[PDB]
Design an enzyme around this catalytic site. Structure first.
Site, short mmCIF file in Angstrom:
data_model
loop_
_atom_site.label_atom_id
_atom_site.label_comp_id
_atom_site.label_asym_id
_atom_site.label_seq_id
_atom_site.Cartn_x
_atom_site.Cartn_y
_atom_site.Cartn_z
N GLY C 137 0.81 -1.22 0.00
CA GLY C 137 0.00 0.00 0.00
C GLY C 137 0.84 1.27 0.00
O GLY C 137 0.48 2.24 -0.64
N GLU C 245 -13.82 17.87 -11.37
CA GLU C 245 -14.32 19.01 -10.58
C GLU C 245 -13.84 19.04 -9.14
O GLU C 245 -13.65 20.13 -8.59
CB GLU C 245 -15.86 19.07 -10.61
N1 GTP Z 1 -10.79 -0.44 6.35
C1 GTP Z 1 -9.99 -1.51 6.19
N2 GTP Z 1 -8.69 -1.42 6.58
C2 GTP Z 1 -7.84 -2.46 6.43
C3 GTP Z 1 -8.34 -3.71 5.84
N3 GTP Z 1 -7.32 -4.56 5.81
C4 GTP Z 1 -6.24 -3.93 6.33
N4 GTP Z 1 -6.56 -2.69 6.73
C5 GTP Z 1 -5.62 -1.70 7.29
O1 GTP Z 1 -4.49 -1.61 6.42
C6 GTP Z 1 -3.29 -1.52 7.18
C7 GTP Z 1 -2.45 -2.77 6.93
O2 GTP Z 1 -2.06 -2.80 5.56
P1 GTP Z 1 -2.31 -4.04 4.55
O3 GTP Z 1 -3.13 -3.59 3.37
O4 GTP Z 1 -2.77 -5.27 5.28
O5 GTP Z 1 -0.81 -4.39 4.12
P2 GTP Z 1 -0.37 -4.64 2.61
O6 GTP Z 1 -0.80 -3.50 1.73
O7 GTP Z 1 -0.89 -5.99 2.18
O8 GTP Z 1 1.23 -4.62 2.70
P3 GTP Z 1 2.16 -5.88 3.07
O9 GTP Z 1 1.33 -7.03 3.59
O10 GTP Z 1 3.10 -5.31 4.09
O11 GTP Z 1 2.79 -6.25 1.75
C8 GTP Z 1 -3.71 -1.42 8.64
O12 GTP Z 1 -3.83 -0.05 9.00
C9 GTP Z 1 -5.05 -2.13 8.63
O13 GTP Z 1 -5.89 -1.71 9.71
C10 GTP Z 1 -9.77 -3.73 5.43
O14 GTP Z 1 -10.26 -4.75 4.93
N5 GTP Z 1 -10.50 -2.63 5.63
N1 GSP Z 2 -32.09 28.03 -12.59
C1 GSP Z 2 -31.23 27.01 -12.80
N2 GSP Z 2 -29.96 27.12 -12.31
C2 GSP Z 2 -29.05 26.12 -12.48
C3 GSP Z 2 -29.46 24.92 -13.21
N3 GSP Z 2 -28.39 24.11 -13.24
C4 GSP Z 2 -27.37 24.74 -12.59
N4 GSP Z 2 -27.78 25.94 -12.14
C5 GSP Z 2 -26.97 26.92 -11.39
O1 GSP Z 2 -25.84 27.26 -12.20
C6 GSP Z 2 -24.61 27.12 -11.48
C7 GSP Z 2 -23.77 26.01 -12.11
O2 GSP Z 2 -24.24 25.80 -13.44
P1 GSP Z 2 -23.66 24.63 -14.36
O3 GSP Z 2 -24.78 24.28 -15.31
O4 GSP Z 2 -23.00 23.59 -13.49
O5 GSP Z 2 -22.56 25.39 -15.23
P2 GSP Z 2 -21.64 24.52 -16.22
O6 GSP Z 2 -20.59 25.44 -16.79
O7 GSP Z 2 -22.52 23.79 -17.20
O8 GSP Z 2 -20.92 23.44 -15.29
P3 GSP Z 2 -19.66 22.64 -15.85
O9 GSP Z 2 -19.95 21.96 -17.28
O10 GSP Z 2 -18.35 23.59 -15.81
S1 GSP Z 2 -19.27 21.28 -14.52
C8 GSP Z 2 -25.00 26.83 -10.04
O11 GSP Z 2 -24.99 28.08 -9.34
C9 GSP Z 2 -26.41 26.29 -10.12
O12 GSP Z 2 -27.13 26.67 -8.95
C10 GSP Z 2 -30.86 24.87 -13.71
O13 GSP Z 2 -31.28 23.88 -14.34
N5 GSP Z 2 -31.66 25.92 -13.47
#
Ligand code: GTP
Ligand code: GSP
Ligand code: GTP
Ligand code: GSP
Ligand code: MG
Ligand code: MG
Lengths: 429, 131, 432, 429, 432
Positions: C137, C245
């Protein structure tokens, strides 16, 4: 006779756009396949403004759909009305812009833009007399903002004498939808100030307020929000598409509303707006409509018009109504609210009337306000930009795509100048 | 023996489009106005000659290439030069030769880093190399 | 189209992978034999007729854990060439992972990745699952990242990491492994999502009423988070977020690329029936420190970015409302250089629930990815641990014996010192 | 009244040829047995252009099928329409040429050529008024190239006042199908320059691009490619076979398109070309057709017309359409694309209109461009030839068949001269 | 019509022949008795009523290997006069094969070939199967080639050869046999396809998961390659290649007539189910050095010609695409005098699979014939081997005892030196 070319960029742009198309088709009596099933000859008379006529009694939207990701396009295609669109007018990438303006404007967007442009040119050539272009998008993302602005820039270069209008969804004041949205907005605005003829500022915060408070929608959805926007949009072009008594168009409106070239950022509004139960308890007379139009709670931009002054207001009325009454109402609002209107533009209300009302209603109204209060929004963005840029936060995401600090700086400066200009006229006597 | 480098995500370790193109123009005495003009491969071949004289057969390079196959030919020469010098970076030829900005800009970003790692400051007149 | 390649390294990576691929199959309706009676396609390639194969590589330096996969329920799911095993493990030694043992299979692993990538038309990037503590990791993953950076360049790379706990260790040499791998991987990773086993156990005990949670449970929980991250790519949504974004919205400076994951709601069926799970309610749950999956205190730190990914019956307005109220809250402070701290994603598909799982079926879920100056504490702890052992050169001879040089230890440590200082600097508020 | 004699050489020649025959039979209402089952008297009026009338109400293609290997012939015979051909008109060898031009021209081909010639003469004598000959083949192999050129040479000698036209499948730029193809092409071109009156250059690279990009065929097959070629071919003779409003023929086209004798190498094109789903979303008006015709992506030769200038263009339209409209379109293309047309040939667009459209379509168009950009192709071949010949690579395969270096040298020289000539006119003002 | 005469010389030639004729029978539906309940005809002549006989001659100087054929499953398939055996073998001695023992049956062999050829209306040529190392495969084959050149002239002759491995020999005198036979056959052969047992074994072990591959397996594999070469003549195809075309497209100079064969895909059924085998995918497999059937490194050489023969569900456009991408690839370099390096054949018939065979049934296969300056290495090795033994005159007395003269050894060696220099000269790029 006066073709409009419609362009949609990104998720927002495409969602609003689809809704708009749905609205328009219903109005013109067009079904999901492109066939006319309407009643009246007036519905088809000016159908060429938004639709190309294909072979075998079908009408196809003069619409271009653009995105760096395909999912939204797919969704649109699968939606109700998805099949009406010309398949070759969907232009999508595979990569995305990762919410990055630079990627939309210079990198991924750059790789896609030529294909868009080719379509656009063809569409333009289709038209006998192109009025111009309408672009729907946000300023806060990467595609709508970066790619969209790029598209605008190229379109303007190609067709400098045609009108460029935008319906821009602007960032909200209370909460941000993305972390870099101030950068994306600021950059976008830099382009918009120089390259658009008019820009409708639409804000989701305002929209939600309208839906919750006025429409009494407990849990409004994005679709509902889009519907309102679509209604506004349709309202602005109604006088181009139907006979009226005092007819407006895109050029005239611009002339009336824009006294100085940079000040073309409007606060749009729509009236009437009522609940399901509450509509039986009131009649839709013109004065009521007027009253609904002129208040802060009904504006679709998150700024109080009472914090500035109106430079100009355009009101567009739809339905059979008395011109005299309308005029009286217009006079009345000016007289009683004198302090909210700039003193050096007499009779700063423009009126248009279209005889065809929208479906379901006997009359409606669309409001376009050029208010100095919009400066607040710009100021907020500037502040947010500054706070981040002074510490160079997230900057490597943009500089990594070839952008330089100078570009950012210039953009900021331009924004600041606009604010100053707005202030100057607000304060002038 | 030639050392090799990697580029992913770093701050204050970039170059603007303008600056990068200025570097290329000053270094090779040419007059490109778009970074995508580097997609022809002639410039990269020349840079390899300047870095490691003798690693590239410059007599084979087409300096006035206009067609995709000509560009491909230049990149074959570049590939061979890379192999001779032991640079292990895979050159995305198909993407570069389409003349796309993104692909070319990323490639020149890497190439600049590679050049800086390896360049010893020697002077040469690239005009003679060209013709 | 938008393909995502998953790499599972060592025991943790493989076992979590088991849980992830089990979940994906249930979500896309793919049987353990690869058959189904179009969304799948970002995670599964398709072959011939009626078979779907994970876009995945499973690697471990010993055969035992992968042999379980080979002989198990999902033997037919994976192609044999995507399950890669050596003979001898890295024995909790980074050196063995990175050099002695790892250099024998790295070429193989990469060759198979190349084959996978050749069948992608729109590669979004890589999801790498591993731990900090194991020799594989730590050492192998570092090696792999280096090679990927060279051969694929600026393609987005994401990490899901079992970060070591404060007072719950398996191995003694965990600090060494952690430090070296962080040092070596830092410049090659775009974003790494830390998760801590202690925290998840606490969640299991406190929220799910499990007396004795097993690693399986933890894995299952992790699988949920991963699903939330990729659901925006695998399904249609109202407002969408993709793998590119995150690094834009969560990483403000290149080195500060460690956001933390929090998932809500985690409840049993018996407890779910007496609760109505609104967006506000789950958001609040998320933003409370006890439900976090790293044992750290955000109340003692500042937020630099929060990304909230909602899924299922969720309405944008509601989300906005929820966030607004959380903004007001005293316990949520953001850095001064960041007035916008929230990125919000909303997807239509409710979280899918694994048959026989510990979690109840809910209409809504949310996965927060948040980046906090409080992580500095963990780094400080790890450095202290390193210092205590290194002052005596405890276990050092093993590492040197596997070809590592002592100078590289000091190098790793100084780099981490620098990292610690970088966080500190970021922490403080702007002058004027 | 104007008989055409059809000749097919080698695998390519015979595969394209069969497809062409299939196309023609359908058009003239002829079934796989040679019987007329059509509807209209116009279908039979000029049937003698391509068919001989046999006893008992049967029509047989005036077609001669030639190859040094029998397998392809067998396949043709076993195909749908295989039984329509006259059995004595299949002339095949047993040996092959082993992809060697020398074998096709001097050795194996020489042994077979007399038998071909005998058939050809008989066919010629059948006809009341022979227009001339059309040969389908590749330049890259041994039979189509060596044997084909030999056949051409003899035919020309016999009938010097009749038109010789060829549909030559030319080597691709990106990938070669054979290792010696530069030799085979170069030699073939030497013969073609002196002995053909017009040559349609068809390139598989272009064809695949068309099929994938324009026709939206994920995995096009050779049959599909052949279909396109056949469509083009049928288009060129349509005005000879059906009544029209402004009627063209082979002679007229040659006159319009060939200002200097050696410059008779055309880039053919066909319009319209659409996907299965995409055809409902657009109407086939004449302007659309024109637009489709005039662009680089729709040319069947792998060279960009924007890299040179058009000396002449012939456009042949099929269907009921307005002559005025057509003329307007022709004017428009010339005016707007002025820089791509040589300045010393005014009105360098020729138009022909045939009233009978092809089956399935209401209108179609066939484009014949004489573009100076074709020089690129020749240059590539010359380069490839040189690279190999300077090291005498593979040379013993040809010299072993009695060929000398001098012949090669002369051929190379001729090719070079043609290129120079092309350049000169490209550059002239 | 287009008949092909097959000659199988010595143990290797005969045993491979067994595998080839078994395959042909399955492909044409011919039973082991010659019966079938028109394509066959290039390989089988037809007699009387309901019987088909191979256009073949099997020759060995000892009876044992051919006696197996006589007594075996296909006893009724061959006419007795086409199975030719002497009494005593060539004892790994070229001299015995070429002179002492071979001169006793050469006339017989040729007489039978003449009889076979008399029943051909369109003889394409000869396929000769043998090895370099055996006394019969080396000495007799050389003799035979000489006679054929005289009696048939410019009729195309092709060789399939078990070339000696670098570090896997059977006999000690292999180098002598190899060198002399190459010397004597060089001016008489038009093209010879080398194959190496070591490489095939590796393929079997690595790609087919066979712990212990037998000669049978190798033979079977070889039979596939041969089938690919002749399928274009035995079946209808989209784009066709015949026996005369290879020598034109693969041999740039008379002496440089040694192209190498590579076949793809070679997989088991268990491994085939999790893979979709596209044209691009198999082409890439072919063009990777580990799947080659001669133990040599093309990465260290240059390609002078590649001929790709596809079969089954294959689409021309796809092939073009595949080739284009391979052209770009760093690991594929071509000589400077050869801008066109690819000849491509496409045939409709999928590869037929022998019941109880090691290979899985696939929709597509491909056989590459490629000519590479890397073969020079093998020649250099062989020459070195010759030199070491010859310096001491080790085993020389045997050859002299069978009537060879010592001067002929030196002659053979010098000729091979010249050959080596010729390759070297070809290698270098053109001035200006
Ligand atoms: N949320 C979550 N955390 C995990 C899980 N398995 C391991 N961890 C966390 O990951 C860390 C241990 O790393 P691992 O991914 O087991 O180790 P690795 O990447 O296999 O590396 P090596 O075994 O040393 O080659 C610890 O912080 C664990 O608590 C899981 O299934 N879920
Ligand atoms: N009245 C109205 N306002 C809108 C609508 N969609 C988005 N807005 C407003 O416009 C703004 C964002 O618009 P948006 O449509 O995301 O711009 P855009 O340039 O197309 O977004 P992008 O392609 O860069 S991710 C926000 O302030 C949102 O509230 C709509 O259907 N009606
Ligand atoms: N692939 C393959 N190689 C074989 C086979 N049999 C023998 N060989 C190889 O052939 C060479 C030995 O030559 P043989 O054919 O046995 O000898 P011979 O031709 O009978 O000559 P003498 O016995 O000396 O008369 C060695 O390189 C063997 O590895 C076989 O069945 N398949
Ligand atoms: N469009 C098209 N091209 C073909 C067809 N068949 C072959 N070709 C192209 O023609 C070239 C070879 O043609 P081919 O038919 O083999 O010539 P030939 O002279 O008959 O070949 P030979 O008898 O000497 S072996 C290749 O470039 C191939 O791509 C076909 O059916 N359609
Ligand atoms: Mg382990
Ligand atoms: Mg023997």
């Amino acid at each position: 006779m006066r073709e409009i070319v419609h362009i949609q960029a990104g998720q927002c742009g495409n969602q609003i756009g689809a809704k708009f198309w749905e609205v328009i088709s219903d109005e013109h009596g067009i079904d999901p396949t492109g066939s006319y099933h309407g009643d009246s000859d007036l519905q088809l008379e000016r159908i060429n403004v938004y639709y190309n006529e294909a072979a075998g009694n079908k009408y196809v939207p003069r619409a271009i759909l653009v995105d760096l990701e395909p999912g939204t396009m797919d969704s649109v295609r699968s939606g109700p009305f998805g099949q009406i669109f010309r398949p070759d007018n969907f232009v999508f990438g595979q990569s995305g812009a990762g919410n990055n303006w630079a990627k939309g404007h210079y990198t991924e967007g750059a790789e896609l833009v030529d294909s868009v442009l080719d379509v656009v040119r063809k569409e333009s050539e289709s038209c006998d007399c192109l009025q111009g272009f309408q672009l729907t998008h946000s300023l806060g993302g990467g595609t709508g903002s970066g790619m969209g602005t790029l598209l605008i820039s190229k379109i303007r270069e190609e067709y400098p004498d045609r009108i460029m209008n935008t319906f821009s969804v602007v960032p909200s004041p209370k909460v941000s939808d993305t972390v870099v949205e101030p950068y994306n907005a600021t950059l976008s605005v830099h382009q918009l100030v120089e390259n658009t003829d008019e820009t409708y500022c639409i804000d989701n915060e305002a929209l939600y307020d309208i839906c919750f408070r006025t429409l009494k929608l407990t849990t409004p959805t994005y679709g509902d929000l889009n519907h309102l926007v679509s209604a506004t949009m349709s309202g602005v072009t109604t006088c181009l598409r139907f006979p009226g008594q005092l007819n407006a168009d895109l050029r005239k409106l611009a002339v009336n509303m824009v006294p100085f070239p940079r000040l073309h950022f409007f606060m749009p509004g729509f009236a009437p707006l009522t609940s399901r139960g509450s509509q039986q308890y009131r009649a839709l007379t013109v004065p009521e409509l007027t009253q609904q139009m002129f208040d802060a709670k009904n504006m679709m931009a998150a700024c109080d018009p009472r914090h500035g002054r109106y430079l100009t207001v355009a009101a567009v009325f739809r339905g059979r109504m008395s011109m005299k009454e309308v005029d009286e109402q217009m006079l009345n609002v000016q007289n009683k609210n004198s302090s909210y209107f700039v003193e050096w533009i007499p009779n700063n209300v423009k009126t248009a009337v279209c005889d065809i009302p929208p479906r379901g209603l006997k009359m409606s109204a669309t409001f376009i306000g050029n208010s100095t209060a919009i400066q607040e929004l710009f100021k907020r963005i500037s502040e947010q930009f500054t706070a981040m840029f002074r510490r160079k936060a997230f900057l490597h995401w943009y500089t990594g795509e070839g952008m330089d600090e100078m570009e950012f700086t210039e953009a900021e400066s331009n924004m600041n100048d606009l604010v100053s200009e707005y202030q100057q006229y607000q304060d002038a006597t | 023996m030639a050392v090799n480098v990697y580029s992913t995500s770093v701050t204050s370790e970039n170059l603007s489009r303008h600056d990068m193109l200025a570097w290329v123009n000053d270094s090779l005495h040419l007059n490109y106005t778009k970074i995508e003009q580097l997609c022809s491969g002639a410039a990269y071949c020349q840079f390899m000659d300047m870095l490691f004289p003798g690693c590239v057969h410059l007599r084979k390079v087409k300096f006035q290439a206009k067609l995709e196959h000509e560009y491909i030919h230049n990149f074959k020469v570049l590939q061979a030069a890379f192999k001779k010098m032991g640079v292990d970076k895979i050159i995305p030829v198909e993407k570069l030769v389409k003349g796309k900005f993104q692909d070319n800009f990323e490639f020149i970003q890497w190439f600049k880093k590679f050049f800086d790692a390896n360049y010893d400051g020697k002077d040469y007149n690239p005009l003679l190399a060209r013709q | 189209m938008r393909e995502c390649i998953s790499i599972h390294v060592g025991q943790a990576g493989v076992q979590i992978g088991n849980a992830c691929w089990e979940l994906y199959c249930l979500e896309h309706g793919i049987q353990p034999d690869g058959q189904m009676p179009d969304s799948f396609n970002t995670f599964f390639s398709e072959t011939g007729a009626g078979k779907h194969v994970p876009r995945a590589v499973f690697v471990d330096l010993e055969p035992t854990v992968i042999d379980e996969v080979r002989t198990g329920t999902y033997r037919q799911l994976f192609h044999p060439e995507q399950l890669i095993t050596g003979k001898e493990d890295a024995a909790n030694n980074y050196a063995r992972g990175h050099y002695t043992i790892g250099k024998e299979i790295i070429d193989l692993v990469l060759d198979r990745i190349r084959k996978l990538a050749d069948q992608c038309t729109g590669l979004q990037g890589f999801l790498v699952f591993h731990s900090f503590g194991g020799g594989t990791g730590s050492g192998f993953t570092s090696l792999l990242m280096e090679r990927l950076s060279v051969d694929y360049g600026k393609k987005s790379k994401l990490e899901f990491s079992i970060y070591p706990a404060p007072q719950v260790s398996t191995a003694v040499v965990e600090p060494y492994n952690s430090i070296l791998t962080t040092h070596t991987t830092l410049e090659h990773s775009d974003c790494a999502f830390m998760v801590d086993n202690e925290a998840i156990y606490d969640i299991c005990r406190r929220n799910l009423d499990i007396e004795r949670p097993t690693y399986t449970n933890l894995n299952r929980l992790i699988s949920q988070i991963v699903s939330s991250i990729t659901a925006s790519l695998r399904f249609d949504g109202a407002l969408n977020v993709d793998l590119t974004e995150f690094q834009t919205n969560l990483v403000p400076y290149p080195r500060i690329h460690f956001p933390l994951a929090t998932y809500a709601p985690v409840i049993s069926a018996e407890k779910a029936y007496h609760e109505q799970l609104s967006v506000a309610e789950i958001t609040n749950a998320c933003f409370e420190p006890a439900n976090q999956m790293v044992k750290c205190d955000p109340r003692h730190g500042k937020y630099m970015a929060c990304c909230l990914l909602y899924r299922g019956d969720v309405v944008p307005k509601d989300v906005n409302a929820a966030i607004a109220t959380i903004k007001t809250k005293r316990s949520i402070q953001f850095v001064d250089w960041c007035p916008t701290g929230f990125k919000v994603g909303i997807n239509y598909q409710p979280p899918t629930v694994v048959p026989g799982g510990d979690l109840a079926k809910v209409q809504r879920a949310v996965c927060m990815l948040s980046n906090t100056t409080a992580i500095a504490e963990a780094w400080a702890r790890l450095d202290h641990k390193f210092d205590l052992m290194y002052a005596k050169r405890a276990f050092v001879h093993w590492y040197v014996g596997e070809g590592m040089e002592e100078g590289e230890f000091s190098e790793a440590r100084e780099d981490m010192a620098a990292l610690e200082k970088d966080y500190e600097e970021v922490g403080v508020d702007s002058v004027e």
